[PDB]
Design a protein around this nucleic acid. Sequence first.
RNA 1: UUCUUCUAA
RNA 2: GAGGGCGCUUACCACUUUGUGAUUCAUGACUGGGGUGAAGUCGUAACAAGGUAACCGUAGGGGAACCUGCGGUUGGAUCA
RNA 3: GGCGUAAAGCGCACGCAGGCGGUUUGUUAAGUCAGAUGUGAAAUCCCCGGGCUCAACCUGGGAACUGCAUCUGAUACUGGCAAGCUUGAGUCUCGUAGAGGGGGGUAGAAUUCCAGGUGUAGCGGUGAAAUGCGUAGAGAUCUGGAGGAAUACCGGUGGCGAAGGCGGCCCCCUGGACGAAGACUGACGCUCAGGUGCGAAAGCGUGGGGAGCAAACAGGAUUAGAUACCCUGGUAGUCCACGCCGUAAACGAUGUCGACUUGGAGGUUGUGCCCUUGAGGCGUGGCUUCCGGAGCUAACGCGUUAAGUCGACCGCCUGGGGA
RNA 4: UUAGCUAGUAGGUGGGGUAACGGCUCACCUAGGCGACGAUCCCUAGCUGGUCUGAGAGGAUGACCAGCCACACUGGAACU
RNA 5: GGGAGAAGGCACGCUGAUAUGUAGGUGAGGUCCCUCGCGGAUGGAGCUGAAAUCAGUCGAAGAUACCAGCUGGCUGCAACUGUUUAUUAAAAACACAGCACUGUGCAAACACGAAAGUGGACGUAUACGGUGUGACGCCUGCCCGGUGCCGGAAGGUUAAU
Lengths: 87, 88, 129
Amino acid sequence: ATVNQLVRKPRARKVAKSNVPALEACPQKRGVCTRVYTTTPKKPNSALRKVCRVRLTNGFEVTSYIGGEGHNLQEHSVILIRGGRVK
Amino acid sequence: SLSTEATAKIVSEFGRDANDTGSTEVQVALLTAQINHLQGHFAEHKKDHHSRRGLLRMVSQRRKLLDYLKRKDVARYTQLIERLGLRR
Amino acid sequence: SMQDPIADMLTRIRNGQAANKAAVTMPSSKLKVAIANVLKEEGFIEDFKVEGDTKPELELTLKYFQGKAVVESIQRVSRPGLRIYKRKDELPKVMAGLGIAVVSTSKGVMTDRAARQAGLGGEIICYVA
RNA sequence: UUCUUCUAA
RNA sequence: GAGGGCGCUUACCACUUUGUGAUUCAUGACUGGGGUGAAGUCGUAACAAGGUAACCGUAGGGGAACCUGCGGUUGGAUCA
RNA sequence: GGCGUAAAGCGCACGCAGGCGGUUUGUUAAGUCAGAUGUGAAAUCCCCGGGCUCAACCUGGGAACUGCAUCUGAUACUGGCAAGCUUGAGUCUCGUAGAGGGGGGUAGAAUUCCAGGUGUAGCGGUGAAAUGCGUAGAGAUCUGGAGGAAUACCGGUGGCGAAGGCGGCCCCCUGGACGAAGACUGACGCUCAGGUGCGAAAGCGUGGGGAGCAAACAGGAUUAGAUACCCUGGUAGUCCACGCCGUAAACGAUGUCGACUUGGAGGUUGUGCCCUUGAGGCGUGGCUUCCGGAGCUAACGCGUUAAGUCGACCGCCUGGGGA
RNA sequence: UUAGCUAGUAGGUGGGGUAACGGCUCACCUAGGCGACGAUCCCUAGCUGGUCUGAGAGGAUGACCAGCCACACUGGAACU
RNA sequence: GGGAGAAGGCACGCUGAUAUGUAGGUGAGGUCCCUCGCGGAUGGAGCUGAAAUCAGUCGAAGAUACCAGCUGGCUGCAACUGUUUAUUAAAAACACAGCACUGUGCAAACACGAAAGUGGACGUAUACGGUGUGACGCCUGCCCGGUGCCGGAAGGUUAAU
């Protein structure tokens, strides 16, 4: 913290990354349904969370949670994702 | 080690006063003759555990006692390392 | 070892207040007297007694008020590793001006409120409060 | 001298 | 007469080609660990002196935690 | 902002560039400060206005544009330049203590082994045993000899070295520290990225040596199992010579060099005075241990050897796993 | 976890060249030049007034307006 | 150290100029010294003579003929130079430096010799003989029951006597 050390080396402010990189700084991105299925969550909760494996515009293959209760989703379907993790 | 009469001669060698003993010229020449007396002790004895505690303590101890007489006085620095045979 | 007599001085003032001593002595300097002749004038010490011939020694008298001390704070602004040179407009106000800031300008040593009225800035030594 | 273990609210 | 034209050739150089490297991305039978489990199997090392005090190095051994040797640390208990 | 234990001070030492600098006098005016010119486009923002019914918006003026250049100063400080001074720093002089270092000897016990005398039936080991060793005479006991390794007591919350560390005695070479009166030197200083050296133990390489001990390994127990803990063995290894490795909870988990700041009880090592009036008293140093005031600390604690108060410079830290 | 880089390179002399100065170009000398104050190499990028946030310090940012720069199917070259 | 002539690419004649012979080599006649010689300096005539540049110029082609390496990538085995089946087999076979074991105290062990004697060796354990392995790097685990070898002398067995 001596200023000579501060002269020889600047304060490296830490660089943070996105947790949602597949959108690549976009609000929403178009996607293609690849597999629609359910998934049991981790220990404190017990459900069958409806979820779909998605091929995106940029070739990314991601999973994205189906909100709500009940849907009409097929594979090979055009959807749109907004973000947000599921805990 | 360097004896009293030998130190007394080196004082009387470079004596500005014959009593001065703050002449680094004397003092350089003292550790000069001291460790030249010790070069037969350390060409003999190599890595002797504390070789730097009583072998290199005089590597550096002669060295930095040169290092103000290094930057001391160009008219006299030129004369002294000539007489002392110093390489640099 | 000895990197500053000034930071030596202010700390000897600082540790003498808490030690409740009446007399803090040290070897004197020309710049030391030029500061010590301000704080008597500014009313933070009582007496300084510069004495010594081979080597001048400044002996101070600490000002105590109602039992406790007067010097509530004593700092160093321009340290020897980092100097401070502020203009006449960037002169500070120690404790909203209630304390004083010792600045040395080309017109010797004075306080900041005098230096504002002198209208010329310089090197800020320390903060006294 | 010897001597172990107790699932998930 | 000079000059110019045209062509000639020269200089430079684009396109393009050869080889050899380098770098980076993708991919790759197989393989290395890593992390994670609301139920498995095996043992029970550490937490108390955790039932052989614990741990650092380093070396060896061993399904697995580990074990053992040398040195150090206490960030260990005990006391007609 | 922090680095004693919550992440974090390199294992230390050396040292260049580097950054940093006692004191005093002049000089210089570089930095610095002040003033003045130039420029810093407009827009924008700010301030004061105006205009659109207001507002948004438009727009007038101002300030500002934190700068840079130039010129004129200023001289306290920081530099630059010279000269000094001696407190810092360093010599000279006498001594002091020490497991400080290498080199070479030399002892004495112990253990092992060998050989012999005496002698007889067990020995050894464990919680019990057993493996094992014994009538081919062990064990035990005495005598003789050989070999390697370590040096009881002293010995000490001792000593020395920067640490890593260093332990019989003697000799040779060699280092560091401290104190005492002095004499001298003239700031000769600090820290130090990169660099350089040292650097426990284990491990590596050639050679050597090998009593004891002992990974691995072997047997015996032990247990449900026992690749362990225990026993009986036993090899590298431990020792030496010369090189490599460069890691340790290399810890005081506190980087180095200054200065200030209540104490008490010690240890060790100097050195004055007082009659040593005995192993005494009054001093004055160096080093180190415990306690503990202020203060600090998340608390715990530290606490003049600071984890108090400040200085200089370096190293480092930035959720956990991954690592 | 980019440390060495450079041969018209670096300087000179002379000639040539351009509106202009200059390896601008050429010849001949010289061996210099650069770099740990980051050369070199790699990745990303038009730049500033400004904009956004922040109490400030700063941080991010360059659509719209400006000032500059660069480009015009691609790669080239001159012409006027 | 190498690999590596890696690979790959460029130049190549002749004529002229530079310089009608240059760089260089050789080196007289001169000149001076000279202890004067089978001299020393100086001195350069002479001869001899590369290499390069520049500019021409000929062919389809200028290292023109003769002469004179095909290179690259992976892997087996042996480290390598070596040695060999004269006369169908040249290697992975052998040898090898290296490693390990073992024997041996000199009148050595051992070998050739009925013997004498000789080699060993005019060497003396850092020596020599034998066997196995075959550089270098990292290494080299377990089992002595068996077979050998070594050590033991209590007892059983037992020759000539």
